[PDB]
Amino acid sequence: NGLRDPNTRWTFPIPYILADNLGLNAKGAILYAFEMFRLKSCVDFKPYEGESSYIIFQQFDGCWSEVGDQHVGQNISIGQGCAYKAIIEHEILHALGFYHEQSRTDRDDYVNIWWDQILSGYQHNFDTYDDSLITDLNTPYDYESLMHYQPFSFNKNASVPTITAKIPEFNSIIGQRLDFSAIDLERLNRMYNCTTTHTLLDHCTFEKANICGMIQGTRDDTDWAHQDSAQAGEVDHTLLGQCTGAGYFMQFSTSSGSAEEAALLESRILYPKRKQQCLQFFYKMTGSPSDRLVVWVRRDDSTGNVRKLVKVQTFQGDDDHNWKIAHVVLKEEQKFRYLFQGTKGDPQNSTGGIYLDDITLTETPCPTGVWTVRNFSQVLENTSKGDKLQSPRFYNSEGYGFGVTLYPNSRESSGYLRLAFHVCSGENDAILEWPVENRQVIITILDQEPDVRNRMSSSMVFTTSKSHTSPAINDTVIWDRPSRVGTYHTDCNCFRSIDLGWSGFISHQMLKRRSFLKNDDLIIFVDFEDITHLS
Amino acid sequence: NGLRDPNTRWTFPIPYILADNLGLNAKGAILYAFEMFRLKSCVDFKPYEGESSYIIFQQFDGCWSEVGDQHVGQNISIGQGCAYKAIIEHEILHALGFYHEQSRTDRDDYVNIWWDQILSGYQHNFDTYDDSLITDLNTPYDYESLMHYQPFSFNKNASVPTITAKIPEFNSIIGQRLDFSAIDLERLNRMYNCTTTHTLLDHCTFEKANICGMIQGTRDDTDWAHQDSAQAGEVDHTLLGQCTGAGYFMQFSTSSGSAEEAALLESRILYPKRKQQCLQFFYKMTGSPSDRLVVWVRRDDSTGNVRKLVKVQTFQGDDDHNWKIAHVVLKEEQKFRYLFQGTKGDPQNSTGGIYLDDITLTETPCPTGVWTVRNFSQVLENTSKGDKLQSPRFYNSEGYGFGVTLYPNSRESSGYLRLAFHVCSGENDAILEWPVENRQVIITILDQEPDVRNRMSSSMVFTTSKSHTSPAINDTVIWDRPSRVGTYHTDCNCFRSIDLGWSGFISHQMLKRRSFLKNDDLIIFVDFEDITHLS
């Protein structure tokens, strides 16, 4: 579905203008979509400074783009209801040179188009282009493509689909709104000659014997073991015992020796392109309550020698002995290495140790809040319609308290999950501005792959506004101070606001595809950040 | 280990000269190494026609290259004993811009260098270069790299290594001479922006529900099932039951219905860049001896419409019900689709059917002769030192008969497999030239991966010669007519020549690694072809 003519190709970075007919929410959503391109490809964007060809993003009727570089500069429309990552990415893929997936030359082998069912003037979105106009880039037809329409697209009648797969199982798959597929990224790479990405700096799952170039020092008293997953209660996070002889983790045993004995595991040297990085990893702590996993940096001392130590974060064990997710903010601007120190506490009171798998390092912020809901498939059967779970309280960089409400069985949309966001009372509220407005909320359900290019995380975005009001609170703004608009909870000693978000955030059937529930548990990320400076 | 300065980079195709001080064997081995680059990368080579920078390949003392593009033209030496794929690939990687892996800036974290062991004048091969000269290309240190030296490299004393890994397990792994590693290909792609490759056209393992864009028509009688491997006593070829819920194959059952019922499985449309292609796949036929698996092409009829049928090959079931390898020559010069017809014969005498997995399509010749040795671990135990196996007799394009001899436990080299080539008598010998004067032999042990970029197949090359002579045949040429120089065999009614080959073709420990013995069986490819046209 890519345009064949090479003169229609861009030169990176693509220069852009955000028009003031976009709201703050759309400007913020566009910049968030640009970060996804940098993370997963070599595509890049710059602010406009008088270039010949450029993209101007505007609010017009509907959501549309031209296809390929129009050398005089060109519109992308992002209308009302289109300020979502997946829709921005689809329009940027039009501008990069891609038609819809149902517009492929071979599409009649894979789908039916019901021309009698398409609304007036939308039928060109269903045209098929010839092999002189469009390339396949030597890739198959992708039902999971972000460029593929959903069955009920521009239909006259809500009961009758416009597009259907010839094999009926794919009617549950076509028109995904998660992210780029693996074939969408492979096409993007083949068109623009990408190999690296601007923002994926490292990842490690420990499956090869060389453990991603990680090394073990001698200043420590002991070593980490590269451990095989071939024992009854010891399986790695990458495969969860799916695959014999094929899933590895690192282990540090704490059941023997002196207390305060330690081992260091240390990365290969890394060259950061930005000033901030997020280190994500998975771990278990089954040993003593006095064991300690400590994350460190070793950085250039300014001579070119990577030897300056800096401690970044400590982790300690509770009664939960399953796999946990960690995020560490690193702030490196010169070459450095990431380090894990496992430490024994009270070996005479330990029957276990420390475990590591699935490390990822990105040149991005870390998520502000992270929530893990355990045994989520059992919760999904034990919870009645409209019964709910609530997250622990999180604090943002500005000091505002917030949380998320999860309704596993939504009353408002049968067979869907409902995620809503609320503000929480917190220790700072007395000095913060109220109502909290112009703050973008990004909620993501994590697709648990260690390589970011494989991930299709579901994400939803809104911005806090004076227009958000409820009859339950005498028609006042939902985002006013939680002690006056919220309701008290013994679970956190909080007042929690009325909760805004999406009934129909994700389908239960979608939640059973990919890695949304990898170890029977659901991981949700939340960011809450001021975008007033984009106005 | 790559050179950082972008002015040292080549423009493709790299112009080359093969100098006439190279023998035929060396010229033929260089052209074979270029095919391996075109198969695994976007690197390309052209004959010289008056360009400014070019590579001239010559026979001088030792085997060496300059590093990066030298803009006035440069030598590669290929000396005596260096006419080997892996050695030629190593020199071409120097010209493309790579130093040895032990020359990385971080190398001291992974290896010990024993300077007092290095023979005089060779020590610069063991130098380490700074991060201003060289890039890591954001890659870990690779023990399995083609650019890494073996332990006994340029050593003064035959018992003492020059280089050792700091972790002793890798002393058995460093200095591999198979092929490019996965990291060496990743470095080459990052340096030159390769995404596609010139010669891999398709591959399919059937692991996704999309089945690599394969389609099933309705002009046939029935369909191929996409089958789950979750049935006892039946699994797929890709994973062989290693991995729960994972491994898929196509299945066509023949145990019910009418005879002559059929199913078509049909590829996506393909645009060949060359005039000849090879379709490799794996299959089983557990049904009736009257079942057929038939390979077809559907090709562009010159209107742009892919509707023209050509039958290419037929396969039928003997008493072996394990996975078999198959190769089909295709000669497509316009867009086409490759097709599998499964056909039922005698469903009242079938308890099984036809199975497909692991399809690969490349713009190459097919191998001239293919040998599968079954139960190879049990053969390797049950065969005494110097006892031998012999292949069926193959025929080349010119009509010469040939075969191979395998000595599973080599007497000459303990812990190695010895593999050798011989000329067989055959139906054409009366009109062929004798002795063989200039035919290159290529022998390959297949690393069984369906994606060619993941293979590290072991290969050896030599050219038949007037200098190959034996005391067993009164100092006459080994390659003279097999009825006058060979011994009669009841196994094929042939005369087989004296064999020539390599004691130490591969170690037993190397053979029990990667995918050389995937289903407890060994696959050997052989090619035997004239290179006199290079003189």
Ligand SMILES: *[C@@H]1O[C@H](CO[C@@H]2O[C@@H](C)[C@@H](O)[C@@H](O)[C@@H]2O)[C@@H](O[C@@H]2O[C@H](CO)[C@@H](O[C@@H]3O[C@H](CO)[C@@H](O)[C@H](O)[C@@H]3O)[C@H](O)[C@H]2NC(C)=O)[C@H](O)[C@H]1NC(C)=O
């Ligand atoms: C020894 O370690 C145990 C926990 O360690 C576990 O048992 C060992 C024998 C080994 O098998 C280890 O591999 C294994 O992980 C400690 O017991 C824990 O003590 C803490 C602190 O008192 C308890 O936390 C409390 O839990 C109560 C509710 O039960 C809360 O009300 C408190 O607020 C607090 O959170 C924890 O529950 C308890 N866990 C268990 C499994 O008993 C033990 O204290 C320690 N002893 C010494 C001498 O260090």
Ligand SMILES: *[C@@H]1O[C@H](CO[C@@H]2O[C@@H](C)[C@@H](O)[C@@H](O)[C@@H]2O)[C@@H](O[C@@H]2O[C@H](CO)[C@@H](O[C@@H]3O[C@H](CO)[C@@H](O)[C@H](O)[C@@H]3O)[C@H](O)[C@H]2NC(C)=O)[C@H](O)[C@H]1NC(C)=O
């Ligand atoms: C019916 O099919 C069998 C083989 O098919 C197998 O058995 C069926 C009942 C089903 O369970 C199938 O799923 C299963 O695959 C035929 O038997 C085979 O016949 C061939 C040809 O005669 C035999 O080959 C010969 O073998 C002898 C030595 O035994 C050699 O000397 C010959 O040169 C030749 O190679 C083969 O051994 C035999 N195999 C078996 C399993 O008995 C059978 O002929 C066929 N009958 C009909 C009605 O077509």
Ligand SMILES: *[C@@H]1O[C@H](CO)[C@@H](O[C@@H]2O[C@H](CO)[C@@H](O[C@@H]3O[C@H](CO)[C@@H](O)[C@H](O)[C@H]3NC(C)=O)[C@H](O)[C@H]2NC(C)=O)[C@H](O)[C@H]1NC(C)=O
């Ligand atoms: C991704 O890499 C591709 C190569 O793998 C690039 O494709 C090449 O673009 C070259 C121009 O930049 C082409 O050279 C031109 O070829 C035409 C005939 O097609 C000649 O008339 C021109 O004179 C010639 N120009 C030059 C400067 O030599 C290559 O032919 C072409 N190669 C292939 C295989 O298509 C892509 O441009 C590049 N894409 C991006 C967007 O980076």
Ligand SMILES: *[C@@H]1O[C@H](CO)[C@@H](O[C@@H]2O[C@H](CO)[C@@H](O[C@@H]3O[C@H](CO)[C@@H](O)[C@H](O)[C@H]3NC(C)=O)[C@H](O)[C@H]2NC(C)=O)[C@H](O)[C@H]1NC(C)=O
């Ligand atoms: C793969 O694509 C890369 C771009 O994504 C290429 O990297 C670019 O190489 C250019 C040279 O070919 C560089 O231009 C040079 O920049 C230096 C300063 O760094 C200037 O002094 C030079 O004058 C300038 N030369 C030219 C001809 O303009 C680009 O800066 C550089 N870009 C990046 C992002 O690194 C790779 O070369 C390319 N690799 C291959 C061989 O395919």
Ligand SMILES: *[C@@H]1O[C@H](CO)[C@@H](O[C@@H]2O[C@H](CO)[C@@H](O)[C@H](O)[C@H]2NC(C)=O)[C@H](O)[C@H]1NC(C)=O
């Ligand atoms: C985006 O579309 C707008 C129209 O919605 C384009 O604006 C027009 O520009 C032409 C040529 O200058 C004028 O004749 C029209 O009067 C303009 N219309 C309006 C309503 O402004 C705009 O040029 C497009 N942007 C780009 C750069 O493609």
Ligand SMILES: *[C@@H]1O[C@H](CO)[C@@H](O[C@@H]2O[C@H](CO)[C@@H](O)[C@H](O)[C@H]2NC(C)=O)[C@H](O)[C@H]1NC(C)=O
């Ligand atoms: C959309 O299509 C449905 C299905 O064809 C229509 O429902 C039918 O309505 C007619 C009367 O107009 C009834 O006689 C049928 O029994 C209905 N069928 C079903 C299955 O409900 C519906 O009227 C159409 N709506 C629109 C917008 O035209």
Ligand SMILES: *[C@@H]1O[C@H](CO)[C@@H](O[C@@H]2O[C@H](CO)[C@@H](O)[C@H](O)[C@H]2NC(C)=O)[C@H](O)[C@H]1NC(C)=O
């Ligand atoms: C590459 O090899 C050729 C052939 O040996 C070199 O050409 C001559 O080499 C000899 C021995 O070094 C010199 O004495 C001659 O003066 C060389 N003649 C020339 C300049 O053509 C050639 O110098 C070698 N070097 C490269 C990289 O071209």
Ligand SMILES: *[C@@H]1O[C@H](CO)[C@@H](O[C@@H]2O[C@H](CO)[C@@H](O)[C@H](O)[C@H]2NC(C)=O)[C@H](O)[C@H]1NC(C)=O
């Ligand atoms: C290579 O090194 C080996 C091992 O050091 C040498 O063998 C030793 O030879 C000395 C006499 O020179 C004996 O005293 C030792 O007992 C030998 N040791 C072993 C383990 O055999 C060998 O001589 C060296 N050869 C060369 C080429 O110098």
Ligand SMILES: O=C(CCN(Cc1ccc2c(c1)OCO2)Cc1ccc2c(c1)OCO2)NO
């Ligand atoms: O065709 C269009 C329309 C934009 N959009 C297409 C689309 C977007 C993401 C996809 C996808 C298809 O399949 C995979 O993920 C559908 C759409 C969404 C919300 C809307 C709306 C239209 O109208 C206002 O609110 N322009 O390109």
Ligand SMILES: O=C(CCN(Cc1ccc2c(c1)OCO2)Cc1ccc2c(c1)OCO2)NO
């Ligand atoms: O360093 C050199 C020397 C060439 N060669 C290096 C080498 C080649 C392939 C490799 C490898 C190392 O590690 C992975 O695979 C070793 C060599 C082989 C045969 C010879 C010989 C030298 O002398 C004559 O016969 N030039 O670059």
Ligand SMILES: *[C@@H]1O[C@H](CO)[C@@H](O)[C@H](O)[C@H]1NC(C)=O
């Ligand atoms: C999940 O269920 C298991 C029992 O199957 C239980 O041991 C574990 O504590 C549960 N986890 C949570 C907190 O849901």
Ligand SMILES: *[C@@H]1O[C@H](CO)[C@@H](O)[C@H](O)[C@H]1NC(C)=O
């Ligand atoms: C391999 O051994 C099996 C028995 O385990 C036997 O059935 C099969 O025929 C053998 N294959 C060959 C030809 O080596």
Ligand SMILES: [Ca+2]
């Ligand atoms: Ca792992």
Ligand SMILES: [Ca+2]
């Ligand atoms: Ca240590």
Ligand SMILES: [Ca+2]
């Ligand atoms: Ca059919």
Ligand SMILES: [Ca+2]
């Ligand atoms: Ca398979």
